[PDB]
Amino acid sequence: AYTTFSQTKNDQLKEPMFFGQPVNVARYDQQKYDIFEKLIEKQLSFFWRPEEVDVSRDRIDYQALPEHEKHIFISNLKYQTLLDSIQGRSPNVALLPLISIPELETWVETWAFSETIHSRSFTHIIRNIVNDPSVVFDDIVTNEQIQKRAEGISSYYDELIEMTSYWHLLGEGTHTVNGKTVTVSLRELKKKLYLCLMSVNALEAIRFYVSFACSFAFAERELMEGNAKIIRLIARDAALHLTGTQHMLNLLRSGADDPEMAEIAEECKQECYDLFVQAAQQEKDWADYLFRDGSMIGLNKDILCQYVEYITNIRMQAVGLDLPFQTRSNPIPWINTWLVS
Amino acid sequence: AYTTFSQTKNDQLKEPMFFGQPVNVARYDQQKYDIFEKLIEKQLSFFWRPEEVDVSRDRIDYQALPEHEKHIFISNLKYQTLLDSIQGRSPNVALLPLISIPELETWVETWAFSETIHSRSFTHIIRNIVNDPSVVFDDIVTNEQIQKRAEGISSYYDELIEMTSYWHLLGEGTHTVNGKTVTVSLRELKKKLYLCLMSVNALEAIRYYVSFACSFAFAERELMEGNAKIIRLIARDAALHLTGTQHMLNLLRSGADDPEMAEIAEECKQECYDLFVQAAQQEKDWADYLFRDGSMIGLNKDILCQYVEYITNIRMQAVGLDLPFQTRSNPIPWINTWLV
Ligand SMILES: [Fe+2]
Ligand SMILES: [Fe+2]
Ligand SMILES: [Fe+2]
Ligand SMILES: [Fe+3]
Ligand SMILES: [Hg+2]
Ligand SMILES: [Hg+2]
Ligand SMILES: [Hg+2]
Ligand SMILES: [Hg+2]
Ligand SMILES: [Hg+2]
Ligand SMILES: [Hg+2]
Ligand SMILES: [Hg+2]
Ligand SMILES: [Hg+2]
Ligand SMILES: [Hg+2]
Ligand SMILES: [Hg+2]
Ligand SMILES: [Hg+2]
Ligand SMILES: [Hg+2]
Ligand SMILES: [Hg+2]
Ligand SMILES: [Hg+2]
Ligand SMILES: [Hg+2]
Ligand SMILES: [Hg+2]
Ligand SMILES: [O-]
Ligand SMILES: [O-]
Ligand SMILES: [O-]
């Protein structure tokens, strides 16, 4: 029931963001929600090339760091690398099959494309600071701490993908497969979509932002500056991605786009809240590990933890969730010099 | 059984291109096949923004055209729009979920991304030459002739997607779904993938080049040079897209990748052959519609038909197939200028 070109003539301005008729014609002269076209344009105006950034002095900087500083750095790098591996493919594989408006379709492909460039930038850094990048790359997959910090990201995507396949193959219903009853419900699939979006919004809004705080800590010190320039270009793209997820979520709950989606959202608020908090907690628990055999100079477990709280509150308010934490002003205003967005 | 982040630590240098373990880590320090890394680098090096191309004059030029030349121009643009509309999403939705090596995975995401830029370029041309793009765009879906020429593109893709879903959900075997037997054979899915690919190769290498010809015809009479700059940029990218499909196809047949794939390529050859013949006849048939209200000095069903046979033979030979048409010199050598 999924089609690469639906032959029905339809008003693309009247479809919902998700679950309506798959997009046929790709046109950009008009949009239901212009935010998406605006986001495609800015992201294209931001196009950059990693290799164009000189990281030649980062190797010695890294060599000269203290062992626990190498640890904090490399470790944070491995996490950023993991998130972008996932983000390079997921939005395409997970969302494309469910989008019903063209501007949203292309924004998703552009967004995913910008993420592959981030991944290439990490190969650029890694290749220039270590002797055998393979060590770093292998560690990303099995590293217990990161599977830990990043736990449940791949799973929200995976289940949504699975459910979408059943929905496209069998459609709404109670069916049977190899002696098992399999129930397919649109509403539960819309809930799966909603929660997956929420989780990608936290990935973009928080998980990535926390990593920036670590990278920029080195930059503040004039250390690993090739990495810093690259991370600055990345945070600028991240700002657009988060705008995109905020808008999709806000349009969904507001009921304007899909009445049923607004109901689903509302009824799942506490579920939504807990994930957000759960996510903040993961980032804190990791700030823990990273700082235990030693603590960086200008950042530490407590400062990072305060930062996790501060941004989390900002992000949750943005999509109408309650503030889980104590209100406080930014603990590391020096970060602003690097977050040009 | 499809996963966005496979937790097994695998030597990505040893996976087949497709059907292996899904890619986890996206690294570009090494490649099983460096041709894909090279296409990624070249494509990124060619990054361009349509709206920056000056199409200002094209509106006068267009208004000045005889209605039949207008018909010919627009009907062409419309098919072009259609092919990039499908190519923008297709490679991601059909291929991504089956790729098992990082370079090819990112190559496909980069290729698709470049097609959405092609589509942006048509919206830029259309809005700068007509009063309501909506007529043109609404005319694409329902245009039977358009639809007739494109027949079978969306279908190969959609069927491959459905089988892939069954594969991911049930795994190989014969299963019982809603009281019916469904068979999921990997060999079979691999055949569907292989033919999809062959079909995409023909889409990139033959269907698009015929459209360029028609596009460039105007440019030779010094008309619609805004559209020509864009078509030239597009042509530049399509050449990378076709080099990517040819390699994928040739690598699979060489038996250097998945061996089973090399026997499928051999067993399917007549099918590969027949699909090119059909696409070719489809392109010839279009001519009857393009030239509805008349031809133009230098471009007619006749020249179109010969160009079709000409390029088809070159593309089939590139993937090791027999040439169905008579050999002949390029019937429109002035095209090479714009092609490079
Ligand atoms: Fe990223
Ligand atoms: Fe991002
Ligand atoms: Fe294209
Ligand atoms: Fe192409
Ligand atoms: Hg998601
Ligand atoms: Hg998700
Ligand atoms: Hg950090
Ligand atoms: Hg740090
Ligand atoms: Hg941090
Ligand atoms: Hg929720
Ligand atoms: Hg919510
Ligand atoms: Hg949430
Ligand atoms: Hg905290
Ligand atoms: Hg294909
Ligand atoms: Hg195909
Ligand atoms: Hg043509
Ligand atoms: Hg032509
Ligand atoms: Hg073949
Ligand atoms: Hg074949
Ligand atoms: Hg002919
Ligand atoms: O990002
Ligand atoms: O194209
Ligand atoms: O193309």
Who contacts A292 (Cβ-Cβ below 8 Å, separation ≥6)?
none
Strand-pair partners of A184: A173
Q: Which residues of A touch B29 (CB under 8 A)?
A: 123, 126-127, 133-134, 137
Instruction: At B155, list the tokens.
Output: 């279908």
Cβ neighbors of A142 (< 8 A, separation 6 or more) are: B7, B9
Burial of B38 (0-12, 13-18, 19+ CB in 10 A): middle
> Tell me, what amino acid is at A229?
K
Which spans in B171-224 are helix H? Answer: 186-202, 208-220
Residue B9 in contact with residue A141, Cβ under 8 Å? Answer: yes
Q: Which amino acid is at A338?
A: W
Going by C-alpha positions, the residue among B251, B254, B249, B241 that lies closest to residue B107 is: B241
The per-residue DSSP string of A221-281 comes to TT-SHHHHHHHHHHHHHHHHHHHHHHHHHHHHHTSSS-HHHHHHHHHTHHHHHHHHHHHHH
Tokens of B145: 């002739």
SS3 B7: coil
End-to-end CA distance of chain B: 45
SS3 content of chain B, % helix, strand, coil (to 5): 70, 5, 25
Beta bridge partners of B99: B18
Amino acid at B49: R
* Chain A residues closer than 8 Å to B133 by CB: 27, 29-30
CB B19 within 8 A of CB B100: yes
Residue located via tokens 């099918």: B271
Indicate the SS3 state at residue A180: strand
Beta-carbon separation of A179 and B176 below 8 A = yes
b/e B153-178 (16+ beta carbons within 10 angstroms → b): bbebbbebbbbbbbbbbbeeeebebe
Do you know the residue count of chain B?
340
Place of tokens 């940029």: B233
From B30, B92, B137, residue closest to A109, measured CB to CB? B92
Give kind and range of the element (H or E) at residue B76: helix B67-90
Q: What is the DSSP letter of A12?
A: T
The whole-angstrom separation of Cα A122 and Cα A128 is: 10
Question: In which residue are the tokens 């979408």 written?
Answer: A164
Amino acid at A56: S
CA A202 to chain centroid, in Å, comes to 7
Neighbouring CB atoms inside 10 A of A160's CB total: 26
Q: Which residue has the tokens 């552009």?
A: A110
On whether the CB atoms of residues B189 and B262 are closer than 8 A, the answer is no
Tokens of A212: 């920036």
- Return the closest-CA partner of residue B109 out of B121, B91, B94: B91
What is the C-alpha R_g of chain A? Answer: 21
Give me the number of domains chain B comprises: 1
Residue A297 CA from chain centroid, whole number: 28
CA distance A131 to chain B (A): 12
Terminal Cα-to-Cα distance of chain A (whole angstroms): 41
CA distance A249 to A104: 13
Could you tell me how many CB contacts below 8 A there are between chain A and chain B?
Answer: 204
Q: Which helix (H) or strand (E) holds A210?
A: helix A208-220
CB within 8 Å of A20: residues ≥ 6 apart: A100, A101
Block residue for tokens 């972008």: A84
Contact A122, A86 (CB under 8 A): no
Dihedral Cα A67, A78, A153, A48, nearest 10 deg: 140
CA B166 to chain centre: 25
* Residue position matching structure tokens 């060599």: A63
**Distance between CA atoms of B149 and B282, rounded to whole angstroms?**
5
Q: Which among A131, A124, A128, A148 is positioned nearest to A75, based on CA atoms?
A: A148
Helices A153-170 and A67-95 cross at an angle (nearest 10°) of: 10
Nearest C-alpha neighbor of A253 from the set A240, A272, A276: A272
Strands B180-184 and B173-177: antiparallel
- Gaps (C–N > 2.5 Å) in chain B: which residues precede them? none
Q: Which residue of B has its CA nearest to A12?
A: B138
Domain ranges, residue B315: 1-340
Bridge partners of residue A297, in order along the sequence? A299
Residue B57: which residues within 8 A CB-CB, separation 6 or more?
A: B225, B226
Q: Side chain identity at B4, as an amino acid letter?
A: T
Q: In whole angstroms, give the CA distance from residue B106 to residue B306.
A: 37
Please name the residue that has the structure tokens 């006849």.
B281
Distance of CA A257 to the CA centre of its chain: 23
| Pair B84, B76: CB distance under 8 Å | no
Two structure tokens written together for A270: 């506490």
Query: Residue B60's CB: how many other CB atoms inside 10 A?
Result: 12
Which ranges in B13-66 belong to alpha helices (H)? 34-45, 58-64
Element (H, E) at A9: none
**Quick count: other Cβ atoms within 10 Å of Cβ A278?**
13
Tokens of A206: 């928080």
Structure token pair of residue A217: 């800590």
**From ligand 2's centre to the CA of A227, what distance in Å?**
17
**And the tokens for B229?**
């700059």
Structure tokens at A121: 């930038």
Question: Is residue A40 within 8 Å of A57, Cβ to Cβ?
Answer: no
Is residue B160 within a helix (H) or strand (E), and if so which, with residue range? helix B153-170
For residue B296, the cross-strand partners are B299
Q: What is the residue-wise DSSP string for A109-167?
A: HHHHHHHHHHHHHHHHHHHHH-S-HHHHHHHHHH-HHHHHHTTTHHHHHHHHHHHHHHH
CA distance B327 to B309: 8
Q: Whose CA is nearest to atom 1 of ligand 23?
A: B238
The candidate with the shortest Cα–Cα distance to B252, out of B32, B77, B11, is: B32
Question: Which residue from A190, A195, A204, A202 is spatially nearest to A98, judged by alpha carbons?
Answer: A190
| Residue B300 · residue B217 · CB < 8 Å | no
In angstroms, this model's resolution equals 2.0
Local structure of B241: helix, strand or coil: helix
B82 CB contacts (<8 Å, ≥6 apart)?
A5, A25, B140, B146, B150
Of A40, A90, A138, the CB nearest to B4: A90
Of the candidates B81, B161, B169, which has its C-beta nearest A166's C-beta? B169
For residue B308, give every residue at least 6 positions away whose Cβ sits within 8 Å of its Cβ, in sequence order, or none: B206, B210, B280, B283, B284
Decide: helix, strand or coil at residue A27: coil
Nearest CA to B198 among B134, B272, B121, B91? Answer: B272
Q: Would strands A173-177 and A180-184 be described as parallel, antiparallel, or unpaired?
A: antiparallel
- Quote the CA–CA distance of A137 and A126 in Å, as a whole number: 9
Q: Which residues contact B239 (CB under 8 A, 6 or more apart)?
A: none
Type of residue at B309: E
Measured in Å, residue B118 CA sits from the centre of ligand 3 at 5
E strand or H helix that includes residue B173: strand B173-177
Residues from chain A contacting residue B113 (CB–CB below 8 Å) = 109-110, 112-113
In the block, residue with structure tokens 């020509």: B228
Interface contact B28-A119, CB threshold 8 A? yes
Q: What is the Rg, in whole angstroms, of the alpha carbon atoms belonging to chain B?
A: 21
Spatial separation of the C-alpha atoms in residues B257 and B18, rounded to whole Å:
9
Q: In the structure encoding, which two tokens stand for residue B204, read together?
A: 């990139």
Using an 8 Å CB-CB cutoff, list chain A residues near B8.
Answer: 141
Give CA–CA dist A93/A110, Å, rounded. 13
Ligand nearest to the CA of B308: 20
Structure obtained using: X-ray
Separation between Cα atoms, residue A46 and residue A118, nearest integer Å: 13
Give the Å distances, CA to CA, from B137 to A21, A24, B130, B134, B316. 17, 10, 11, 5, 33
Q: Which residues contact B337 (CB under 8 A, 6 or more apart)?
A: none
Starting from the CA of residue B157, give the closest ligand. Answer: 15
C-alpha–C-alpha distance, residues A37 and A35, integer Å: 6
> How close B166 comes to chain A (CA, Å)?
8
The CA-atom distances, in angstroms, between A224 and each of A127, A140, B318 are: 14, 21, 48
Longest dimension (CA), chain A: 64
Ligand 21, atom 1, residue with closest C-alpha: A238
CA–CA distance from A210 to each of A148, A203, B215 (Å)? 16, 10, 51
Q: Which of B7, B44, B157 sits opposite A49 (nearest CB)?
A: B44
Amino acid (one-letter) located at B169: L
Task: For residue B301, give the CATH number of its domain.
Answer: 1.10.620.20
| B51 within 8 A of B119, measured Cβ to Cβ | no
Select from B165, B161, B156 the least CA-distant residue to B196.
Answer: B156
Taking the CA atoms of residue B149, residue B154, residue B156 and residue B160 in that order, the dihedral angle to the nearest 10 degrees is 180
Q: In what order do the strands lie in the sheet with B180-184?
A: A180-184, A173-177, B173-177, B180-184
